Structures are given as C-alpha cells and as structure tokens.
Symmetry: C5
C-alpha cells in the first residue's frame, strides 16, 4: 500500500529573474512530513521522544533498516543547489519531519515575450517522486506552502500563487507523484517608460519642432541620424531578451519607427528636389502636408501596433 | 526547560554591496557558547579539561549521545556560504564553544533608492533558531558582535551598528529565536559628483556660452545633441540600479534636463522662425529673454527637485 | 565473458548554447541497468525484494564484495557536473538500476560557422566505458534515451535526435564501449533579420534616397559615415562568434558592404571632381549611372555571396 | 607551556589583482612544522620511521588521542579557498610536517589610489592562531616563506617581500599569534601612457593645430566635441577603480582638461563675438593671445597637478 | 631505494585560452602506473586477480598498511580542479593503475605579446612529486601522453607537443621529480585581418579618395575624426590583452596611425593657411606633395614597424 508524503514548499527570496536565459533564482525551504512505522522507537525516562539527525546519518540509518525513502527530484532545477540546512526530526511514532533550505536556479520555460514589456509570466517549481504512486503519494502539507513577503524582487510583482498535485512518467511506466508551486508575475513598466518610451518620444517630438525651420536639407540630416538612434535603441532592447524566433511588441515598435523615419527621409528628399527644380513656392505649399504628416504617421503607427497586439 | 544559546556575529569584511541585485557580501565570524550538561566529561590528572573537535565528528558525537543541537539558519543568506573554520571546543562542564568563519552573500531587501545618490540604507543579517523558544533561547554573546575596522568598503560608509533579539515563526507554530546584526551605511558621493554632476553641469554651462554667438540654428543643433548626451547619461545611471517600479531623485534629475533641453529647442526654433520671416531685429530684442531664460530654467528646475524630494 | 550494461541518456533541458566557447549546457538524466549475479540476495517474508542505496554506500558495498563496477566517463564533459540525484535500486536478482540527474556543460567541437546565420549544427554527448569490451559491453536501454519536450531553448530548434554505440581506445589497448546521444539543431533567424538585415538594408536604401538631392559632397559624407556603421555592425557580429580561422557568410556579407561603400565614395569623389573642374552638365548626365549603379552594385553583391556560398 | 608552531607561506602565482574590488588572488603553499611529543610512535624493523596522512584521517587521529591542533585562520581570506594538497608527514619524534596548497582571493584593504596610476601598494596575507599565545606560539619557518619567480603578473611589479610575527585579539581576551607575509608592488605605466596619455595629448595638440586656420566658429565646435571626448575618457578611467570617496591624480587630471576646454569655448565665443560686432582686426590682433594661451594653459595645468600631488 | 612512478598526461580539450589573465583551460586525463610490492595480495580460484577502488577507500587502505603514496601537485594549476573520474585498479602484483579525469585552468606565464597578433606561445602543465627523488622517481608512461584530436580550440593552432622530466626543489632540500607536458600554439589571424586590418586600411584609403576634392578644411575635419576612430580601435585592442609593461606590434601599429594622422592635420592646416593668405595657386601646386605624401607616409610607416619588429 502507498505511504502519504506531505510536501510543502516556501519561497523566501527571488534572488533574480534572468529573462535572457529564461530562468529564475530563489531561496527556498522544502518541508516534508512522512510517517514510517518501521522507524518508530522506544525511549527511557529522561531520554528524548524526538531524535534529531543530519540527512547523512539518517540515510545511513534507512539503508541499515532496509527502508526505502521517498526519493524526489526538483524537475525544473538548474545548476548547483546550494544547501543551508538538511535536518531530520524523527518522533517516537516514526514521523519524519524534514527541512531543506536551499538557493537554486530553476528553468522558466513558460516565457512569452510577445507582449513585452506589458507581459505577465508564469513561474513554477516541480517536485517529482522518483518512485511511482503505488509506493509513495504526495500530499499537500497544509499551513506552509507559498511565497514570503520579503522576496526582494524589484522589477517583478507577484500577482498570485498556486499549489497543486499531478502525475509524471519520467523514469517509470506508471504514474508518479508531482508537487507544483506556481506563481504569476507582471512587470514594473517604470524602467521602460523612463529609459525607452520618454527618450524615443522626445527624439520624435523635438525632431518635429525643427520642421518649423522650413529647411528640408536639415530635416534629411535629422531623420538620418534619428534612424541611427532607433537602431541603437533596437540593440539596447535585444540585449535584455533571448534571440527569440518570434516578434515582440517592442520589436514591432522599433521596426515601426524605422519605417516612419525612412519615409520622412523619402518625403523631405522629394520637397528638397522641388526647391532644387525652381518649385520653392510649390514645396512651401506642400510643406503643410509634410508638417502635419509626421505627427499623424506616428500616431497612426501607435494605433496600428495597439490594434495588432490588443 | 529551554537552554540559553549565546550568539555572537562579527563582520570582518564587506567584499561588496551589489545594489543592482540588492544584496551584499561579507566575511564573518559566528560565535556560539552553549552549555549542555549531557556533554560533560570526566578527566584524569594530566589529561585535558578541554576537548577540540571538527564540526563533523562533534555532530556525530551528538547523534550518538541522542542530543539535539541548536540548529540555526542565516535567514537572509544567498548562494554558497564558503567556510574557512568550523571548530568546537568542549569543556569538562559541557560548554560548547563554536566558531564559524565564512564568506557569504546576504539579501538586502531594505533598499530604498528614492533619494539615490543621497540615500542611507539598512543592511542586516538574520540568524534564526529552527527549534522554538521552549527548547532553545538565543542570548546576546557580549564582547564580540559588530563590524571590524578593515571592512575594505570604499563607496559606503557605515554610520552605526546594532544588535538585537526577536521572534520568528518560519517553521514552527510557536515563537522561535532570531538574532539580528544590523548596520546603516550612507554613500560617498565623490563618484557621482566627478562622473555625473560636473560633466552634466559643464555640458549645460559651456552650451550656454555659445548663446553669445547669436546663431539660433547653431543653438538648435547644440540642444539636439545635448538631449542625446542626457539620454546616454540616463542609460549610465540605469545600469547601476535594478529596474525599479519607482522614480529616483536621479531619474527626476535626468527627466528635468530632458524637459529643459526640449524647451530650449522649442524656443530657438521660434526665434529662428522670426529671423526667417524678416523679423531679425525683433528676435534679437527677444534674445535677451532666451539668453537669461536658460540659466533661470535650470536653476528653477534644481529648486523644484530639491523641494519635491526634501 | 562480458556483462551487458544498459545505457540510457535523456536531456530534459538545454540551459543554453554558447557559440563563442563552442559548448552547450544541459540538465540530463542518465539511466543504467546492469545485472550482476554476485550482488543477488535472499529476503525474509515482509522484507523488501528491492534495496535502495545512495551511490556512496553502494560503491562501498562493491569494494567489500570485490566487484568491479562499469566505470564510465562523459568524454566531452566540461567543468563541474552538478548532481541532483545519484540513486541505486538493487533487485533480489542482482539487477542494478541507476539514475544520475545532473546539470553540465559539454564540448561542441562540430561547430561549423561557414554558413552562419543559416547554419545547422551537430551536438552530442559521449558516454565511455573506462573498462574494455571484454569486461563490459554497452547496450541501448530501450524506451528512455532522447530529448524532452520542455528543453527551454529559444534560438535553436532541434531537427532530429539519434542514439548509437561505438568503440573508443582512450585508456585501453583494445576497443572499449561508447554510447552516443546526438542531436541536430538549426537557428531561428528572427534575431538576425530584426537586428542585422533590416537595419543594414534600411541604412543602404535611405542613403540611396539622398542621391536624388544631386549633392555629390553630401553623398561622400554619407557613404563615409555608412562605412563606419558597417564597421560597427562588423564588431557586433564578431562578438557572437569565436575568433575563427575561416570566413563566415556574415563576414563576406560585411566585407561586401565595405567594398561597395568604398567604391561609392570613389565614384562621387570623381563626379564632384568634374563639377569642380567646370564640367557640371557632364557630371549631371553621368549622374544617372551613379544613381542606378548603387542599387545594382548591392543587388549584384547579394547574388555573388548567394552563389559563392550556395 | 606553549608549543612552537613553525609557519611558512610561499606565493607561487598572482592570478590577478582586482583593484575595483580591492582584492588579489594567489596560488600558495602553506608549510607548518609542529613537534607534538604525544603523537610520537614506536616502529619495528622494516616499518617506516615517517607516517603519511591525508588531513582528514590525521585530524580523526588527533580527536582520538584528545590532542588540540594549532587551529588557524587566513584572516584576510575571501570566498572559496580551492585546495590542491593537504598532506601530513608524522615522524617517529612526533614532528608534524604539513603542506597546504591552495588558490584563494585575499582582501587588499591597503589600497591608496590617491596617486594612481603612479601608485605603490601594500598587499599582505594574515595567518592567525585561533588559540592564544599560552597554548601555541607561531615562529618563522626559515628557508621557505616569500614569493616565487613565475608569479605571472604583468601589470604589477613586486618591489620587496617581508615576513613578520605579531599578536591579534580576534576571538580571545589575551594575545594570539599572527604570521604576516607582506609585499609591495608598483604599477607598469605602459598601458596608461599608450591608452590615456598619448591619446589625450594628441587630441589637445592636433586641436591646437586648427587654431592656425583662424576660424573661431570651427574652434568652438572643436572644443565642444573635445569636452565630450574627455567626458568619455573620464568614464573609461572610472571603470578601472572603485567608487572612491577621494580624488585621484587621474580625476584631477580629467577635471583639469574639462576646465581648460570650458575656457577655450568661453574665449573663442568672445573672439567670435568681436568679429560679429565689426571688430575683426581687433579679434585677429588678440588671436595671438588665444593661440599662445592654449599651450600655456595646459602646460600650467600639468605643473599645477604635479605640484598639488608631489 | 626509489620506486618508479609512471606519469602520463593527455589533454582531451582546450576549453579556452584567456590571454587577458594569461592562463588556459583543459579537460585532461592523468594516468599513473606504480608498483608497490607491499600492496600485493593472494587470491583463491574464481576470486579476482585485479581489485578496483575509489581513490577515497584506496587512500584509507594505504594509511592502514602505513604506505606512503607518491603525493603529487599540478604546479601551475589555478582555481578548482573539477574531477570526473578518480579510479584505482590494483593487481595481485601490487601494480597500482590510476586514472584522473579533470577540468582545470593552468597558469600560462610564458606569454610574450611582443609580436601579437603574429605571436607563437608556449603552454605547459607541470606535475611535481612532493617527495624527493630518493623516495619516488617519475618516469614517462609510454603510449599515452599528449593532446587529443578534438581539442575544440578555434583561434589557436597547436604546432607541436613535447614531454620531458626535470627536477624541482619546491618543498625539499634535494631534487624532486617533475613531469612536463608542453605545447606550442600560433594564432589564426583571420579575426585580426577582418576586424582590424581591413577596417583600418579602408578608413585610410577611402579618406585618401577625398583628397581629390581639393578641400583642405574637409581634409582637416576628416583626419580629426579618423584620429578618433583609431583611438577607438586602440581601446578595442587593449581589451584583449593584459595591461603589459611592454609595447606590442599592435600598439606600435596604432601609435603609428596616430602620428601620421596628426601630421596630416598639420600639413592640411598649412595648405589651408596658404589659401587664407591669398596663396591659393601655390597651395594647389604644393597639393601634389600632400596627395602623394599620404600613401607614402603610411607605406613608410608599415615598412618601419616591419623592420623594427622583424
Ligand atoms: C537628435 C534629435 C534632436 C532634434 C533637434 C535638432 C537639433 C540637432 C540634433 O543634433 C543632430 O542630431 C542628428 C540626429 O540624431 C545627427 O545626425 C547630427 O549629427 C546631430 O548634429
Ligand atoms: C555638446 C556639449 C558641448 C557644447 C559646446 C559647443 C560646441 C560644439 C560641441 O559639439 C556638439 O555636440 C553635440 C552632441 O554631439 C551636437 O549635437 C552638436 O551639433 C555639436 O556642435
Ligand atoms: C546614416 C544614414 C542615413 C541616411 C539619411 C541621410 C541624412 C544624414 C544622416 O546622417 C549621417 O550620419 C553619418 C553617421 O556616421 C555621418 O557620418 C554623416 O555625415 C551624416 O550625414
Ligand atoms: C576631434 C579631435 C581632433 C581634432 C582635429 C580637427 C579636425 C576636426 C575633428 O572632428 C571633430 O570631431 C568631433 C567629434 O566629437 C566634433 O564634435 C567636432 O565638431 C569635429 O570638428
Ligand atoms: C570616415 C572615413 C570616411 C572617408 C570618406 C569621407 C566621407 C565623410 C565621412 O564622415 C566623416 O566622419 C569622420 C569621423 O566621425 C569625421 O571626422 C568627418 O568630418 C566626417 O566627414
Ligand atoms: Cs533582484
Ligand atoms: Cs533531492
Ligand atoms: Cs547552519
Ligand atoms: Cs555639420
Ligand atoms: Cs561519472
Ligand atoms: Cs535558453
Ligand atoms: Cs570592495
Ligand atoms: Cs585553516
Ligand atoms: Cs595576471
Ligand atoms: Cs594532487
Ligand atoms: Cs573553445
């Protein structure tokens, strides 16, 4: 018959979310409650009713007593799991109380940058039983699982936390227990507003101010240099994310500014070609279209992405 | 009844404060004094009154003697704690004298960048008893706790150090002991004065010198390029800090220079529009306002932030 | 006679492919099935038919019983192999069932950047028997080997996976068993299209728009600055790859743009030399060749590489 | 009575000096000679007079024999000390001969950048006895201590090495032994001459050549851009050092170039203001002062720092 | 009498050569054959003639039998040596067969950048006996030592490999054995040709094309900006190497381009001073010298370094 293994997982800290490598790092405490009647013991008066063991000697005790422990794996773990505490408290009953304090990076494969920077992501930790459900069954340890209140993450803001149990078939033919700690987090846009939106909007607006100078050559030089600035911002954005196989809302936004700037060069080349061909009065009358086109093109572009993505 | 566990924590070095990840790194010595009568021993003349043990065999001795040690955790620890020394000296009495020399990173969740770079921060180390206050009670080991005098930190300057004891309820129903080593540190502004204030002030002042040339086109080209420089400084600042969800005094300072520079372009576009419309004498009379506006705008801006943040 | 050792290797995650260092990193599970009759045991009613061991005590048991285990090496491994699980399940029969969960970097020496970014690469993991084929023979553990479905790699896309067995002669005179897990992966071009093709094409096209201004000096200044931009892109590409001893399709592409831009400067220097020597009407008639040359040169260049590499 | 512990420390390599973090890294061999009569032994003919032990079993032997070993700490150590060798050779006499080969980072708190890059620094390694001078006294192991001849450091050049003994009161009431290995090193200026002095001097000299063109507008544009170059060099320098609370000779040097460049803009604005107000012949006569001012200002500045710092 | 210790070292991979830190990283296999008659054993029919041990228990066996093992050190090792395999096979004879598979960084103190990038470097691994030549003598294990055929290094190309034995006096009075694995490697120049030579040559050639425009002011602006580009390339080169105390062929090359560019500004300032002083026909006749000087100066410079370094 299968023995109930009570899994509890609590994230104390989010040491960082690395979106370029699609992983996240946490400081967490794993808690297990497992009653093994075979491990029960007798005690003399004065002698303790609860025995405390370092994982090392407790496992040496299980091998001796020929007992199978609920061997588990953190399925989505990455690299080294640096441990702080691995402590066992065994009661007279045979109730094993295990605490595992660690720092570890976990894979974040649920990363969807399609709406970046206005994106909401799913982050999870998978705890899998190596032995199937006929031997061990994971149960939800009540009053422990979740996320702490001093996570130390500044960019991300956790919207909700969930815990559930499911099956997996990793090393076995039949179903094996899997404990899931899931959390959703959205982004603080302040960085993107201050470093990307405000600068890009300023470059466009203050470049439009110079249209009132009525110098087409000057506009051509300005739009040319503006295109270079946007190419630079394009590289600034690309450095934050992985080399995705799909277009970001941010990628569409930058390509958009490229197109408009390209056309601004094209248009003012045409107006300056009119001036050069003795048609200055004509280019000056058409100039109203060039001056009002610019804000409308960018405001039409903004409504195009907003429609194409929402 | 509960046994008194004497906690002492001394920071020898500050290997660095990483404000982008909101953590700090120290080289520290943990000292514990704990009297366990069960560990007491008898000795023959000439035989030692004090037994010295490597933590490994001392824990093997506690498991044998069925004794529970005051299992503790550095609550705000991050990653690997690299150890130097883990040594035990056990007296005939049963007084355990423990020394733990380590290098480790600790979470700094108290980070408030709102007044950066004129900010004062709180840094702490939390030492928690896994077992509740009915079993073990932490006490302040006198004549040890604090910070050394060769911390090796150059940017930060520690203003004060504090030690106190409090309860926590991390793994238990009832209160459990927590030792706290806290320190406040303010920043050395020399870097920000030399690399950010002096350059930004120079760019603004020497750009104002060229107003005396009375070439509005030249001013437009200058203010346009100045805006780009400030956008570059904006990225230089952003690289030091996390992607915060709030505005910094520094962020307000840069946005301030953007606004003024934007208006400088706007104003000189207007003056040059007057010259282009045969109103050169008028633009030259108004030029006194443009020349005196510039220093007043920046000096009004400086007083605006200083009021808005202080 | 030789004992059959059943090797199974499954990659759960691709934590990253580092093309600058020509290596890749995985989270993987190694599975071994090995029947050693000497390890067989007798059991009492109620006592388990399957004994579970930590690798540490299981090896201590093999040394005691004077049994030689199939000592193996991951031939192309690099750095530290961080382990998660090292668990043994021994049946009454003497069938050893081993599971090795790890995170590790592996050498990728098959890297051929000649057609980068349109390249397809081979990645493999080599599992070698230290002892020759007369002692141990590796066999393919059926229903396990391969790659998972949540690898978490965004740039690369795995085209096919293969498993085979071969000999090696690393530490022995005679042939020794080698298990191979191979996979082919091609690249997602979206990054290169968005950050390199679109910008380079835009710079060239919008620079051509200004030819319609009929200012040869302006073209010279433009082509000169364009050359600098391409030199900058050249450095952006070089940072992704190792310092190869061969030319990339990308390197040829950039050298191509250098040559055309160099000749654009040369041509427009000539046209401006005609204007300076009182031959303005002649330079204006020849200008049709200069304006139509530019798109033809770049379109001839594109067809040259495409032929030279395909 | 106290037992003499013979300390010897030899640095084989300087893997690097990190001046931004004020630490240094070495590959070193620690050698200890300690006579403990209690550890002495008897031997049969043929049996060895010298017993060789792995630190692990030798410490297990000391715990058994209830002997206190001279527990020591590398006081200024940082992070992980990666060990190569930890070997004990025990003679029939009871003379313990210990060798500790390691790679480790050590705090460099003696860093004084005030005269950077012409600075001389002190680097040391502190070896402290955990037990006081009444139990163990450190003595200088002769014919071992110092620095090797293939340190592999290219920027720094070790001027002298010293070894001495002093007391410390880290964990004890009374004085405890401390072994000190100190070395002084000065910097190779070639990098600073080639990358900072020569470029800055060239920018200034070749900018002065253009004064002979007699175009005040051109000088204003040149000095403005030069100021930007110096701001860039300012950031190049700041990246090598920590965010110090004091001024560097280098910081003074850069601030100096800012001031002169600021005044160059101011002066040429004045000369161009004379030309604009029909005073061209006057500005041309004063131009001798502007042309001779520039070299004198920079040569007066160079003598100002040289006096202010030497 | 001394016992022969057979050393064999084979490098499977070159994980990278870090020329900034003057070290290199390898994946290697160390092989030792050592006959210790004291370790010999008796066997019954059916019982094995060869005993297989994990280094841990084999060393525990040597301490028990009071046998001294040939304790060795990798003299030029750096940091952590991550081990894969540490396996012992002991024959009835007492022949110890040891295999050590590792990943490790090693000091490269032989680095001579004087002719960089046309340099050839020496890389080695030193294996030293802690015990002198009277106890243990290292011998060359034949048919093993060298370098593999899938080293995975792309920039460097190994020219030759050598193995030899020498003495050292590190911890001993008398000579102690040292095994040396040496290899010479030269560089693949393709990176330097594509990223440094071609761009620098293009900048110079296309800047010369503009001399045919006969605008001295334009040349001054061009040479000034070219100087800035070379200063940028100067920083690009400096980032690859340590802060050496000697001049590189590359450093001389960049300083060379600075000098010529400085003189180009000087010359064209003179020609433009002639034009400004009503001597346009004279400056135009001298212009032949200015136009032919430029290619000759650079071609004289190239022959100067080539003579000064070869
Ligand atoms: C930069 C946006 C500011 C708009 C206001 C116009 C003033 C001129 C700004 O400077 C110019 O900006 C161009 C585009 O970035 C560069 O090509 C050029 O070299 C530089 O002189
Ligand atoms: C810029 C701070 C120094 C002000 C002193 C005035 C002299 C000219 C300095 O060069 C200026 O640099 C800007 C940024 O690149 C360009 O936009 C601008 O067109 C260019 O003239
Ligand atoms: C950048 C190509 C955009 C084409 C549109 C034509 C307008 C001018 C763009 O500014 C150009 O930027 C270069 C940057 O290197 C400078 O060298 C060059 O003198 C300058 O004119
Ligand atoms: C620049 C150091 C070399 C001086 C030699 C004189 C020739 C002109 C050099 O080009 C200058 O490049 C700066 C880039 O920042 C611009 O700001 C400035 O307007 C421009 O004139
Ligand atoms: C860059 C070498 C190309 C040679 C062909 C001349 C075309 C103009 C290229 O733009 C130039 O860029 C330099 C660097 O910023 C400036 O100093 C210079 O005044 C500017 O005109
Ligand atoms: Cs963080
Ligand atoms: Cs585990
Ligand atoms: Cs602990
Ligand atoms: Cs210009
Ligand atoms: Cs292994
Ligand atoms: Cs990835
Ligand atoms: Cs520091
Ligand atoms: Cs020590
Ligand atoms: Cs070095
Ligand atoms: Cs060793
Ligand atoms: Cs490599």
């Amino acid at each position: 018959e299968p023995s109930d293994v009570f899994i509890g997982l609590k994230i104390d800290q989010i040491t960082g979310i690395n979106q370029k490598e699609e992983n996240f790092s946490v400081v967490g405490s794993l808690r297990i409650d497992w009653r093994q009647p075979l491990l029960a013991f007798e005690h003399a008066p004065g002698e303790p009713k609860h025995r405390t063991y370092t994982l090392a000697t407790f496992l040496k005790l299980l091998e001796e007593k020929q007992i199978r422990w609920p061997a588990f794996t953190y399925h989505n773990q990455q690299g080294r799991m640096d441990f702080q505490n691995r402590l066992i408290s065994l009661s007279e009953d045979g109730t094993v109380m295990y605490l595992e304090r660690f720092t570890s990076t976990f894979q974040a494969p649920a990363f969807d940058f399609r709406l970046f920077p206005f994106d909401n992501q799913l982050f999870f930790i998978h705890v899998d039983s190596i032995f199937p459900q006929h031997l061990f069954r994971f149960q939800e340890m009540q009053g422990f699982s979740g996320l702490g209140d001093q996570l130390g993450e500044e960019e991300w803001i956790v919207t909700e936390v969930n815990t559930h149990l499911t099956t997996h078939n990793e090393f076995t033919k039949g179903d094996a227990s899997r404990f899931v700690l899931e959390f959703h987090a959205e982004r603080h846009l302040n960085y993107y507003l201050m470093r990307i939106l405000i600068p890009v909007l300023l470059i466009i607006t203050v470049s439009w101010f110079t249209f009132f100078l009525q110098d087409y050559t000057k506009r051509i030089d300005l739009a040319g240099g503006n295109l270079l600035l946007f190419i630079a911002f394009n590289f600034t954005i690309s450095s934050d994310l992985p080399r995705l196989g799909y277009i970001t809302l941010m990628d569409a936004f930058l390509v958009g500014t490229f197109i408009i700037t390209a056309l601004v060069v094209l248009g003012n080349v045409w107006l300056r070609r009119l001036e050069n061909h003795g048609k200055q009065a004509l280019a000056r009358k058409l100039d109203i279209y060039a001056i009002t086109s610019y804000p409308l093109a960018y405001l039409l572009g903004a409504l195009t992405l907003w429609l194409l993505f929402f």
